[PDB]
Design a protein around this ligand. Structure first.
Ligand SMILES: *[C@@H]1O[C@H](CO)[C@@H](O[C@@H]2O[C@H](CO)[C@@H](O)[C@H](O)[C@H]2NC(C)=O)[C@H](O)[C@H]1NC(C)=O
Lengths: 49, 49
């Protein structure tokens, strides 16, 4: 209990829904900040990127 | 020592003895092209990461 490597994702981080229009807090892959989101069609990404 | 299943000759694959799976932090598999010339790898550490 309260140890080991077997945990669960039942915390507040439960795959929340994205939103556009208002700047919110950022926790995207160990990065913080704020900013308005805007949907844009981009195709310069890769699998590891 | 470690052998490969591709036409084994004498020895067998045996490098550790563990009757139970210990606490593991990372374990995964990746794929690559089986028909290539050479494979490059790069390892390092910084600030404990
Ligand atoms: C794995 O590597 C081989 C050789 O490097 C790739 O075969 C080449 O594929 C290209 C794309 O059609 C051809 O133009 C070359 O003539 C092929 N070379 C040979 C020697 O066959 C193969 O496509 C690679 N596979 C993957 C999944 O990356």
């Amino acid at each position: 209990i309260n140890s080991g490597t077997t945990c669960s994702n039942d915390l507040l981080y439960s795959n929340t829904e994205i939103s556009t229009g208002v700047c919110v807090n950022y926790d995207l892959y160990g990065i913080t900040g704020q900013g308005i989101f805007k949907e844009v069609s981009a195709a310069y990404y890769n699998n590891w990127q | 020592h470690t052998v490969c299943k591709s036409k084994g000759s004498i020895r067998n694959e045996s490098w550790h003895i563990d009757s139970s799976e210990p606490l593991c932090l990372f374990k995964k598999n990746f794929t690559y092209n089986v028909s290539a010339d050479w494979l490059y790898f790069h390892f390092y550490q910084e600030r404990g990461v």
